[PDB]
Design a protein around this ligand. Structure first.
Ligand SMILES: CCCCCCCCCCCCCCCCCC(=O)OC[C@H](COP(=O)([O-])OCC(O)COP(=O)([O-])OC[C@@H](COC(=O)CCCCCCCCCCCCCCCCC)OC(=O)CCCCCCCCCCCCCCCCC)OC(=O)CCCCCCCCCCCCCCCCC
Ligand SMILES: CCCCCCCCCCCCCCCCCC(=O)OC[C@H](COP(=O)([O-])OCC(O)COP(=O)([O-])OC[C@@H](COC(=O)CCCCCCCCCCCCCCCCC)OC(=O)CCCCCCCCCCCCCCCCC)OC(=O)CCCCCCCCCCCCCCCCC
Ligand SMILES: CCCCCCCCCCCCCCCCCC(=O)OC[C@H](COP(=O)([O-])OCC(O)COP(=O)([O-])OC[C@@H](COC(=O)CCCCCCCCCCCCCCCCC)OC(=O)CCCCCCCCCCCCCCCCC)OC(=O)CCCCCCCCCCCCCCCCC
Ligand SMILES: CCCCCCCCCCCCCCCCCC(=O)OC[C@H](COP(=O)([O-])OCC[N+](C)(C)C)OC(=O)CCCCCCCCCCCCCCCCC
Ligand SMILES: CCCCCCCCCCCCCCCCCC(=O)OC[C@H](COP(=O)(O)OCCN)OC(=O)CCCCCCCCCCCCCCCCC
Ligand SMILES: CCCCCCCCCCCCCCCCCC(=O)OC[C@H](COP(=O)(O)OCCN)OC(=O)CCCCCCCCCCCCCCCCC
Ligand SMILES: CCCCCCCCCCCCCCCCCC(=O)OC[C@H](COP(=O)(O)OCCN)OC(=O)CCCCCCCCCCCCCCCCC
Ligand SMILES: CCCCCCCCCCCCCCCCCC(=O)OC[C@H](COP(=O)(O)OCCN)OC(=O)CCCCCCCCCCCCCCCCC
Ligand SMILES: CCCCCCCCCCCCCCCCCC(=O)OC[C@H](COP(=O)(O)OCCN)OC(=O)CCCCCCCCCCCCCCCCC
Ligand SMILES: Nc1ncnc2c1ncn2[C@@H]1O[C@H](COP(=O)(O)O)[C@@H](O)[C@H]1O
Lengths: 120, 140, 320, 55, 51, 52, 175, 98, 347, 49
């Protein structure tokens, strides 16, 4: 869809204008969900290799959680960047083409005639 | 076979039953020839005589389905005097299903194909009416 | 892990340590051939590592503390019950033979892992190429059925083709009469109930099917019983054999690398012992396997991987 | 009659038998290279002549 | 779901390895006959060449 | 996934055989050099949908 | 009809393709493909590509010599089919020949034809350029640019040939 | 377009249908793959020499390389048919039907 | 096989796919496909049995035929456009030939006839490479040429692929043919939303790669080639039965599992373009795929088929396989649906 | 002393534990450093001081 926007700055995971946006917080529930996915990954890795699931390899569980948070932070940055690009292109296109986006004259319900369909 | 479908649909329902019956017959015959071509493709018949026997059998089965379909649909549209009405194609699809069950020599496949082909032909008539797009052009 | 393709690339070729003492040698013979110490004597003069004959509890002796598990956890089979009732209704005959074939397959994998890692030849007793002869006797005496032989031939066909024969196969010529005399003098009350035709069938598939089909791919050293009592004869002949037959000659680093990779993963070794062929001798039902597996998990040192059990003294689990 | 056989017949059993029939006919292949590439030929010639997919 | 055609289909082997089906290699039988500049007048070598 | 590495790294692997209007050996022009150059300079950056 | 010489060489080209497409035997398949590859270097040479026709001649000569050796050693039966030993060879051989001369007739009677594309019927001499290329044939300079310009093309082609030898020796090993 | 492209595209279609309809014989279809590469060579080289687009004159050579660089692959995949089986008949290649 | 030669051959497979992905030139695209095929043939012949030779022969014939059709599409592009830019095509005949070539390279129906045979012939890791990594280069070419792809052709290939790959898996007890007909159905799913929104095509490609790699990694970690040997998994390591339960319920398209993500999003982009009949028929046809996934979960996790005695030995040896990224792939293939708006990283 | 064969995961691989802990600590501190630079850049490009 937006492949012509990233056709002048190719393969930039986060462009220069991505830094105009507020970053995801450290307590971001999307990022916290990815951290819980890291905890689940550590528990599955302890389970399938016949380790005690909650005790064995606290460093290994901790690096699973940390690695998922470290990848998911930049993934959320790119997500919020591309939705900001979506909204920016939408609003600039509406602002540049006024005749294709007419301001609808809102009629109030005292003029609007709706057919009444009774339930009987 | 893009224009077989066009020369079927471009004629008003319940007006000229012969040309509609022949158009649906040719659509059914083309479909039967495609089924026959893949049938001799994937499963080798025992000889060329058996191959053209299977080709003619599938072609005449599907052509009889198309013929009795177009005949029954246009005759029902004439005797009911309601062209834009998928009950006509429900009756025509049931006649085509009974045709398939007669050619395959089983009443159960005839009744099941009656029901499902009648529903299918009704849905095709409704798609012709409201303009339902099955291969829709991308707009957004 | 320790060994893999990465250690193979960086310089660890297995023919760098393959010397002429690195010879896998398997001693064969009947039930009381006197090979039981002879093989150790063949192991003690050449400096080879002796592996005793894998009974029911070889896999129990390798894992855990090396002590045998109870018979409901390993095998579900009894040798003395086979001696007392060979034609049993529950089919302990082929179930026992299948468990013995699995234990010998694990033993032969241990022999090859020792030979390819430590570079030292291994003395076995009755490796997997000599298992089937007992099976054949158990078909000739009507002890098992033909579908049991078909199941064994399928397991053998998909397992033994991945493995090499021994270098030296030491057979001992003991007739049935001296075997009977040593069993009567042996002192085991269960071992005396063996019929004579069973031992005769074992000697027949020894001398008619096993030793002919091995001699192409190894070098047999067939001896009698009195010169089996002199093991310096046997070592004295092993030290002067000219290894020219068998598929051991066309073995470079790559083929033995793939052999050492296949060998060191014991579940891949045992992958086709438990094939899904439903036979009433080996098929344990759902609730019985559930009960036995849940009892196996509750065992000391068996709940987890071999360095992750608090009950047997594995420290530092939270950093492993 | 109805709620053990016929209402049991019309939606689930006829659908189950139809999908089983098509599953047997699709996967009844002899695995020959000749018939597969002959079917590829028939597909391309239906695509050109009979469906006008090159238009 | 076995039909009439899919009834001789035995299941494939466990290790996906088939028996080698040792059909005859047909060693080409050369008649290095007596009329030859190398066979000294009278020598019929019936030889079996593998190529 | 046109992972445009060649524009990202600035290396030139196959932007040279791509059109007839490119730098040719010994400055050889094609028979349709001017037509292709005019259509490329017409359709540059205006997109496919407007360019066609 | 001498101005149509690329056309006549192309008729012999398609007749060679009918020769090895009917597949009698790879001996005669190699025969027909050598005939077609030896008239293809006469089709393409009248456009100026003498080097680039001599090479498709030479590479396919080496190819058919190797394919000869393999079909004499592997793809060999007792009675090889020439074109007439099997009716399924001869029927589609005659069919391809009659359809090729049929579309010769339909293009020299009308001077246009339309199978899928629309084709002219005048001889292809009309579309040449009216200029001279100086002291170089331009196809020679373009194929000489494979080293100065086509570095990446050289790298991927040589790497494909190296691993093609590696691939072929790993396949034909068995163990 | 020009007259010669009729017969060169016709030769591509003839080698296509020669490849795409087997005759229980694999070397005869590897020959049809080589013929399809020949027709693609002749067609692309006619167009490139027609355009005087000289820089892609190295394009058919490279094309030709990968022609034999797959066709030799077919030959190396032929002997593995013919060492297991007696011949290269494609009806011996039906063991993956179960 | 030498491990050095295995590393070289896998890097050459990756190199061919990267050359298809990054290049701007059609000859370079065709070189990438030739290099990918040539390098992947010894991955299919890793063990040297007649099944691998038959599988590699069928795969070589299909991909060589597809490469021929692809180069003819390239040459007709060269004629009717005079250039070589990997972009839209300038002739519907070349677009049809290229779409046929890529449908043969993907094994989409009615060109599907090689995927279960080649997948059944070769081992599980080479089948994994075939069903995941080889589905990347032709989908790159389909992403790059979509202003010229005919609508009715790719939609016919898509829905016929979904129906035929649905009916294919319902008669299978070998796991590799199950995953192969699943691949045919899911390539139909990927290419159906191609001309509507190809970001959803890339999303379905990524989620299918993750789920398929999870299933083949579980199959390698349990050494299972048949359904009835996958049904012995409860007696050996019962956590693997839970993992195959959650992954096979994920691949069927049940919420809250992540395999509901692509399909729904595909419908989310097909109904915007006023197509309602076609995603409805596709979604109803996906119930067949879910049916044979339910069959495999009935075999493995939900029931307990009677195992054999020698399983008692395999209790005494834990798995020492290198299970590469198995918990990560399982978590991403089951618990990613609340992160559904992450798909904008593909925009 | 229990196991008759010394298990590979009997003693902890202290090099692997050290690499795990150091890599995870570096990922956390580089993540916090990148987050602080990002909040500074966002407050700088707009002037929300
Ligand atoms: C479709 C038409 C049927 C074709 C397949 C039928 C089954 C195969 C068969 O014929 O086997 C016999 C025969 C040989 O098979 P066999 O091995 O002998 O097996 C049969 C047994 O021997 C036993 O044979 P039998 O005749 O004794 O018993 C079979 C049984 C006979 O039936 C019975 O015994 C009882 C059932 C009575 C009839 C069904 C009543 C249905 C009522 C309506 C449904 C409920 C509606 C409720 C709500 C109402 C308001 C909406 O019939 C079926 O099972 C047919 C099932 C229905 C097929 C369509 C289902 C589509 C579902 C898609 C999702 C929705 O094969 C053939 O003849 C092959 C040719 C078949 C026809 C070719 C294709 C024709 C296509 C025409 C156009 C179709 C358009 C698309 C329609 C579907 C998509 C919307
Ligand atoms: C947590 C979820 C993931 C758990 C994975 C590991 C599970 C496991 O093995 O547990 C054993 C372990 C207890 O066992 P154990 O005594 O240690 O030793 C292992 C046994 O020997 C185990 O015995 P075994 O392995 O020898 O054989 C027995 C067998 C028994 O099994 C059988 O006999 C066969 C199967 C029975 C029938 C099937 C039952 C259903 C199984 C599938 C699940 C379906 C529902 C999921 C949703 C639908 C998916 C289809 O397996 C089990 O008992 C394993 C239990 C597995 C339960 C969890 C499965 C995880 C994957 C599926 C759920 C997650 C993905 C889907 C979710 C989608 C969204 C809702 O359980 C746990 O540790 C559970 C977690 C408890 C602590 C939770 C703490 C949460 C703290 C939150 C705040 C702090 C974090 C902050 C993060 C952010 C930082 C920035
Ligand atoms: C940029 C793109 C980056 C994409 C992800 C890159 C990592 C995954 C792919 C590479 C791979 O195959 O890694 C093997 C993988 C282990 O494979 P495995 O079979 O799963 O391991 C089983 C046990 O962990 C076996 O444990 P062990 O005995 O080897 O000892 C512990 C071991 C010790 O390892 C070390 O100490 C390695 C230290 C050096 C690391 C490399 C630097 C050189 O640490 C671990 O294994 C920690 C867990 C590894 C997690 C791998 C996946 C990470 C996250 C992937 C992305 C997920 C995104 C989710 C988004 C959700 C929402 C859309 O990871 C490592 O060996 C190191 C992971 C380092 C992650 C760095 C993340 C940031 C990169 C920038
Ligand atoms: C439990 C057993 C029975 C199950 C019955 C389930 C419901 C049966 C009917 C479902 C129809 C399909 C979904 C309709 C969604 C309509 C949304 C919409 O916008 O409609 C207007 C749109 C109209 O298009 P539009 O809205 O884009 O266009 C604008 C409006 N006009 C037309 C005026 C220009 O309708 C359609 O596009 C067609 C809808 C019907 C399609 C029928 C196909 C399915 C056939 C029957 C399937 C039956 C169940 C299948 C499973 C059975 C078991 C395997
Ligand atoms: C884990 C992912 C690691 C990614 C590291 C960074 C790689 C990179 O630079 O990717 C750039 C790429 C965007 O490049 P772009 O030109 O937009 O390509 C769109 C294709 N038409 O970015 C992307 O493609 C991001 C999305 C990749 C997601 C892959 C895993 C899901
Ligand atoms: C009509 C007809 O012929 O029905 C009988 C037919 C079986 O015919 P046969 O017995 O072969 O003669 O039977 C069939 O063809 C099967 C049933 C035909 C259709 C029955 C429709 C009603 C079903 C019950 C609805 C309940 C609500
Ligand atoms: C359950 C199954 C539900 C099926 C629902 C199908 C709904 C109809 C969609 C196709 C159709 O018939 O549409 C009618 C349309 C004729 O109207 P129009 O759009 O004007 O076509 C002229 C094109 N320029 O015609 C067309 O668009 C083309 C004709 C399509 C015919 C489809 C039937 C073929 C035979 C049976 C299968
Ligand atoms: C309202 C909807 C009505 C239809 C719902 C779906 C079909 C009916 C429910 C599922 C099938 C019920 C059943 O019991 O099927 C069993 C039958 C035989 O399966 P088998 O593997 O032999 O089982 C062992 C012994 N029973 O298995 C079969 O016959 C297989 C049938 C598979 C059908 C899957 C669902 C397809 C739905 C979309 C069709 C388009
Ligand atoms: C059934 C089996 C077959 C049985 C019959 C076999 C008959 C004998 C076949 C052997 C001869 C094959 C000849 C093939 C073409 C060789 C091309 C050639 O001669 O090239 C040399 C030369 C290159 O020099 P150039 O750079 O072109 O110079 C011109 C500018 N100063 O080029 C020139 O000087 C060009 C001069 C004009 C060339 C005319 C066009 C080519 C004519 C081809 C005729 C048909 C060849 C058939 C080959 C079949 C091989 C078996
Ligand atoms: N495959 C087998 N079948 C029957 N008995 C066996 C088998 N393998 C080993 N044995 C027994 O192992 C013992 C070997 O004898 P000894 O060498 O005296 O320990 C005898 O009791 C044999 O019966």
């Amino acid at each position: 869809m937006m492949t012509g926007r990233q056709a002048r700055a190719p393969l930039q995971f986060l462009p220069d204008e991505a830094r105009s946006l507020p970053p995801p917080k450290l307590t971001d529930p999307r990022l916290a969900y990815i951290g819980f996915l890291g905890y689940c990954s550590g528990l599955i890795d302890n389970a399938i290799r016949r380790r005690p699931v909650l005790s064995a390899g606290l460093h290994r569980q901790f690096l699973y959680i940390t690695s998922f948070v470290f990848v998911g932070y930049y993934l959320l940055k790119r997500q919020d960047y591309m939705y900001a690009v979506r909204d920016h292109d939408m609003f600039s296109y509406i602002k540049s083409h006024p005749e294709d986006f007419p301001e609808k004259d809102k009629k109030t319900y005292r003029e609007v005639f709706e057919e009444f369909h009774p339930v009987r | 076979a893009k224009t077989l479908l066009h020369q079927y649909w471009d004629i008003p329902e319940g007006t000229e039953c012969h040309r509609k019956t022949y158009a649906a017959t040719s659509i059914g015959g083309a479909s039967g020839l495609v089924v026959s071509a893949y049938s001799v493709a994937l499963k080798t018949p025992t000889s060329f005589l058996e191959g053209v026997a299977r080709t003619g059998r599938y072609t005449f089965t599907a052509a009889a389905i198309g013929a009795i379909f177009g005949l029954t649909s246009c005759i029902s549209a004439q005797v009911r005097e309601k062209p834009d009405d998928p009950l006509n194609y429900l009756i025509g699809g049931c006649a085509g299903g009974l045709t398939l069950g007669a050619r395959t020599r089983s009443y159960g496949i005839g009744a099941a194909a009656c029901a499902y082909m009648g529903l299918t032909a009704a849905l095709v008539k409704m798609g012709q009416l409201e303009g339902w797009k099955v291969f829709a052009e991308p707009k957004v | 892990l320790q060994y893999g393709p990465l250690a193979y690339i960086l310089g660890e070729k297995t023919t760098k340590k393959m010397t002429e003492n690195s010879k896998l040698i398997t001693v064969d013979g009947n039930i009381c051939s006197g090979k039981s110490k002879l093989a150790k004597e063949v192991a003690e003069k050449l400096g080879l590592k002796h592996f005793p004959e894998a009974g029911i509890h070889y896999a129990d002796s390798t894992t855990g503390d090396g002590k045998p598990l109870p018979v409901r956890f390993s095998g579900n089979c009894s040798l003395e019950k086979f001696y007392d009732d060979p034609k049993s209704n529950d089919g302990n005959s082929y179930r026992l033979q299948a468990w013995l074939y699995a234990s010998r397959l694990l033993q032969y994998a241990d022999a090859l892992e020792h030979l390819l890692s430590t570079g030292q030849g291994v003395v076995l007793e009755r490796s997997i190429y000599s298992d089937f002869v007992f099976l054949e006797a158990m078909y000739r005496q009507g002890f098992i059925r033909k579908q049991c032989v078909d199941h064994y031939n399928q397991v053998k066909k998909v397992t033994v083709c991945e493995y090499l024969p021994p270098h030296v196969v030491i057979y001992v010529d003991v007739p049935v009469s001296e075997v009977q005399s040593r069993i009567q003098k042996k002192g085991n009350p269960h071992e005396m109930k063996i019929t004579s035709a069973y031992l005769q069938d074992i000697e027949n598939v020894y001398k008619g099917t096993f030793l002919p089909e091995m001699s192409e791919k190894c070098e047999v050293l067939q001896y009698s019983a009195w010169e089996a009592e002199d093991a310096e004869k046997v070592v004295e002949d092993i030290q002067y054999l000219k290894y020219d037959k068998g598929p051991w000659l066309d073995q470079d680093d790559r083929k033995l690398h793939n052999l050492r990779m296949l060998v060191q993963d014991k579940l891949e070794v045992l992958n086709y012992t438990s094939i899904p062929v439903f036979l009433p001798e080996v098929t344990i039902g759902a609730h019985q396997s559930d009960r036995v597996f849940q009892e196996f998990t509750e065992l000391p040192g068996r709940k987890y991987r071999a360095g992750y059990n608090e009950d047997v003294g594995d420290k530092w689990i939270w950093l492993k | 009659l109805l709620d053990l056989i016929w209402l049991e017949t019309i939606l689930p059993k006829t659908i189950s038998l139809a999908q089983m029939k098509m599953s047997t006919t699709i996967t009844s292949q002899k695995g020959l290279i000749k018939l597969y590439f002959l079917s590829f030929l028939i597909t391309i010639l239906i695509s050109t002549t009979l469906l006008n997919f090159h238009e | 779901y076995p039909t009439k055609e899919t009834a001789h289909w035995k299941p494939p082997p466990w290790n996906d390895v088939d028996p080698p089906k040792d059909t005859l290699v047909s060693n080409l039988t050369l008649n290095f006959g007596p009329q030859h500049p190398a066979a000294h007048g009278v020598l019929r070598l019936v030889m079996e060449l593998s190529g | 996934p046109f992972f445009d590495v060649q524009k990202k790294l600035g290396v030139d692997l196959d932007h040279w055989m791509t059109i007839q209007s490119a730098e040719q050996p010994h400055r050889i022009p094609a028979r349709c050099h001017a037509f292709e150059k005019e259509w490329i300079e017409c359709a540059h950056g205006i997109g496919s949908i407007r360019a066609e | 009809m001498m101005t149509y010489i690329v056309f006549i060489l192309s008729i012999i080209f398609v007749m060679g393709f009918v020769g090895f497409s009917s597949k009698p035997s790879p001996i005669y398949g190699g025969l027909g493909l050598i005939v077609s590859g030896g008239v293809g270097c006469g089709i393409v040479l009248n456009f100026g590509g003498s080097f680039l026709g001599l090479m498709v001649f030479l590479i396919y000569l080496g190819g058919m010599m190797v394919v000869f050796g393999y079909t004499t050693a592997m793809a060999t039966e007792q009675y090889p089919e020439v074109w007439v030993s099997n009716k399924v060879v001869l029927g589609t051989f005659i069919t391809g020949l009659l359809m090729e001369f049929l579309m010769v007739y339909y293009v020299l009677k009308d001077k246009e034809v339309e199978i899928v594309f629309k084709f002219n019927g005048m001889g292809d001499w009309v579309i040449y350029d009216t200029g001279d290329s100086g002291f170089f044939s331009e196809e020679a300079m373009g194929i000489a640019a494979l080293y100065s310009y086509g570095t990446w093309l050289v790298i991927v082609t040589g790497w494909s040939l190296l691993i093609g030898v590696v691939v072929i020796m790993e396949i034909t090993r068995g163990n | 377009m020009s007259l010669v492209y009729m017969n060169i595209m016709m030769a591509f279609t003839v080698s296509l249908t020669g490849l795409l309809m087997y005759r229980s014989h694999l070397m005869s279809s590897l020959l049809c793959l080589e013929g399809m590469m020949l027709s693609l060579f002749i067609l692309a080289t006619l167009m490139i020499l027609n355009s005087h687009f000289t820089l892609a004159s190295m394009m058919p050579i490279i094309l030709l390389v990968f022609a034999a660089c797959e066709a030799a692959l077919g030959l190396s995949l032929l002997v593995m048919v013919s060492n297991t089986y007696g011949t290269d008949y494609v009806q011996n290649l039906n063991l993956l039907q179960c | 096989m030498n491990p050095i030669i295995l590393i070289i051959i896998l890097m050459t497979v990756m190199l061919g796919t990267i050359i298809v992905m990054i290049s701007t030139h059609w000859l370079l695209i065709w070189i990438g496909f030739e290099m990918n095929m040539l390098a992947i043939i010894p991955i299919m012949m890793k063990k040297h049995n007649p099944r691998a030779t038959e599988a590699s022969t069928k795969y070589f014939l299909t991909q060589s035929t597809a490469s021929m059709l692809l180069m003819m599409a390239i040459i007709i592009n060269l004629m009717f456009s005079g250039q070589w830019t990997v972009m839209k095509l300038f002739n519907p005949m070349a677009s049809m030939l290229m779409t046929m070539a890529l449908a043969m390279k993907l094994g989409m129906a009615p060109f599907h006839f090689w995927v279960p045979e080649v997948t059944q012939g070769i081992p599980l890791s080479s089948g994994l490479i075939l069903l995941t990594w080889q589905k990347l280069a032709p989908m790159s070419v389909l992403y790059q040429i979509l202003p010229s792809i005919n609508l009715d052709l790719i939609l016919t290939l898509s829905i016929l692929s979904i129906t035929i790959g649905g009916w294919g898996g319902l008669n299978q007890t070998q796991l590799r043919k199950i995953m192969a007909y699943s691949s045919i159905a899911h390539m139909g799913w990927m290419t159906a939303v191609l001309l509507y929104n190809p970001t959803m095509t890339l999303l379905n490609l990524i989620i299918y790669i993750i789920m398929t790699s999870t299933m083949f990694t579980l199959f390698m970690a349990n050494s299972t080639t048949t359904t009835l040997s996958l049904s012995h998994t409860w007696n050996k390591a019962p956590i693997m039965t839970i993992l195959v339960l959650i992954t096979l319920l994920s691949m069927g398209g049940l919420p809250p599992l992540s395999g509901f993500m692509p399909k729904w999003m595909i419908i989310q982009e097909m109904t915007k373009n006023d197509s309602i009949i076609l995603p409805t028929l596709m979604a109803i046809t996906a119930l067949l795929n879910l049916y044979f996934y339910m069959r495999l979960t009935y075999s493995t996790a939900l029931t307990m088929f009677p195992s054999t005695n020698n399983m008692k030995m395999k209790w005494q040896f834990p798995t020492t396989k290198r299970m590469t990224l198995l918990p990560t792939m399982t978590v991403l293939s089951t618990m990613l649906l609340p992160l559904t708006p992450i798909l904008s990283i593909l925009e | 002393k229990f196991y008759i064969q010394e298990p590979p995961h009997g003693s902890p691989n202290w090099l692997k534990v050290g690499l795990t802990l150091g890599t995870s600590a570096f990922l956390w501190i580089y993540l916090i450093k990148q987050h602080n630079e990002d909040v500074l850049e966002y407050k700088r490009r707009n002037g929300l001081e």
